[PDB]
Amino acid sequence: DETGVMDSLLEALQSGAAFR
Amino acid sequence: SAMMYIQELRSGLRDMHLLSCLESLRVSLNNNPVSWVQTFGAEGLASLLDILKRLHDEKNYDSRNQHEIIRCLKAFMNNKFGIKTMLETEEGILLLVRAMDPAVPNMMIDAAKLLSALCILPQPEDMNERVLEAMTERAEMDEVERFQPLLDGLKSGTSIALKVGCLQLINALITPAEELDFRVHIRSELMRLGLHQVLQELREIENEDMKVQLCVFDEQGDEDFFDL
């Protein structure tokens, strides 16, 4: 029910946090 | 409303009317709650994916319409249901990878992003495997090496946003992987394709987002050769 899920993933990619 | 979009998307529309309704749809999906998005559901997704496939498969408003779909896709997938429902599709991952045309760099940027985010998903799986297979699938369709569209986007002439985009997808394909020998194998197939010559150039560039993806690429490259 919460949006901006993609929006969280795009930001972790962009900064580098995702990796990991 | 959710239902009229679908009806309109199944009505045989073309060109600007298609563009305009896709634009409308895009805002709708962006502004509306997750219940409206389920209302639009897999039936809605399937009709977007249907037009996408027709546009992919044919050749004035084509690029724009493909792009606007890719934009509609981002919105649909900006919640759990939409992510699940895309990943339940037979062909949607593939139609994204096919949206990575270096000739249309801003849709490639948008498509590469959504593929990169799938790759780092906590659930499903190795979605990186799923994306690679789709790239494999696309490579023999277009009769190119599978990582070539990505190396074409790192070429010197292209926008920094694209460069960032490609390197970011390289990183999303590799990082999540548990196997060292897979990781180095990918890294190595990319270097065979001319990645080493481009890193020299990329490493000159002034950009913080670019500096970030290069740091990730380099540091994981070091640690893998160290492990091996």
Largest Cα separation within chain A, whole Å, is: 27
Chain B residue numbers touching A3 (CB-CB < 8 A): 33-34, 78-79
Cα separations in angstroms, B205 against A3, A14, B29, B169: 35, 16, 36, 18
Cα separations in angstroms, B179 against A5, B155, B193: 28, 29, 22
Largest Cα separation within chain B, whole Å, is: 58
Chain A residue numbers touching B86 (CB-CB < 8 A): none
Q: Which two tokens stand for residue B138?
A: 């696309």
Token pair 């809605």 in the structure block, residue:
B44
Question: Does residue B78 sit in helix, strand or coil?
Answer: coil
CB of A7 within 8 A of CB of B78?
yes
Radius of gyration of chain B (CA): 18
Question: Domains along chain B?
Answer: 1-228 (1.25.10.10)
Look up residue B125 and give its amino acid: E
CB of B164 within 8 A of CB of B213?
yes
Query: For residues B16 and B140, what is the distance between their CA atoms, to the nearest angstrom?
Result: 32
Name the residue facing B171 among A4, A9, A19 (closest C-beta): A19
Residues 6+ apart with CB under 8 A from B19: B61, B64, B65, B68
Query: For residues A20 and B119, what is the distance between their CA atoms, to the nearest angstrom?
Result: 12
